Structure 1
Amino acid sequence: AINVGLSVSRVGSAAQVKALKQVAGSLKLFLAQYREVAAFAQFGSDLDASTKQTLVRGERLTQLLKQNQYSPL
């Protein structure tokens, strides 16, 4: 279980696989929007479709991130 908001890699995508650089390009942005929206959502404010696009996409991403002990890939 990783808290990726306080995780950094200051060497950028030069240490990342080229294929993976391309694919995960907006992964950070989506997640950043998910985190913000999710926080807002808990103050129970009514949500427009633009926020709920993020939220709905975001939930799928959250499940995608999850790792189970002792599984490489």
Structure 2
Amino acid sequence: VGLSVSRVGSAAQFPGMKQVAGTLKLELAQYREVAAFAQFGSDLDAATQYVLERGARLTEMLKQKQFAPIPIERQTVAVYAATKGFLDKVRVQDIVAAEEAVISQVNPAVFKILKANGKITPALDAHLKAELRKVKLPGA
């Protein structure tokens, strides 16, 4: 991400993705600094460890398998579940399963209104705050 650029993408993407991808790019930017810094986790600050845990959560969120492209409305709610709360309990090894738990467990009625309205309206923001809580995360 540090070297890949899209020099038209500033307001040339999905508006619902643009709501969350600014915070995604900013909190990954702060992870790309301290990531090479703190390989260790013996003696940390409370501030750099928060950035390192959010960045590791977003990194293991963003990967995906081959030959399976996701629709934009279904990866938007995964990035919405990762840049907001809802995922800070699975360590790193469950976020691939936690995202699939999100996509399988969230009511598929929000995908239709996200795909149709283009962005996350505040009513859909309230139902997306709500419906992401009643999923069964596999973090045991």
Q: TM-score range by the shorter chain?
A: 0.7 to 0.9
Taking only the aligned residue pairs, the percentage that are identical comes to 74
The alpha-carbon deviation at position 58 of structure 1 amounts to 1.1
State the TM-score, normalizing by the size of structure 1: 0.82
Unaligned segments of structure 1, at least 5 residues: none
Measured on the aligned residues, the alpha-carbon RMSD in Å equals 1.9
Residue identity opposite 2:25 in structure 1: K
Distance 2:41 2:57 in 1: 21
State the TM-score, normalizing by the size of structure 2: 0.46
- Which of 1 and 2 has higher RCO (CA within 8 Å, sep 6+)? 1
Unaligned segments of structure 2, at least 5 residues: 71-140
Please, which of 26, 35, 42 is the counterpart of residue 38 of structure 1?
A: 35
> Is residue 70 from structure 1 mapped to residue 60 from structure 2 by the alignment?
no
Distance 1:23 1:5 in 2: 18
Q: How many residues align?
A: 70
Residue identity opposite 1:63 in structure 2: E
List aligned pairs for 1:51-70, cutoff 5 A: 51-70=48-67
Over 3 Å off, 4+ runs: 42-46
Larger Rg: 2
Please, which of 2, 18, 23 is the counterpart of residue 15 of structure 2?
A: 18
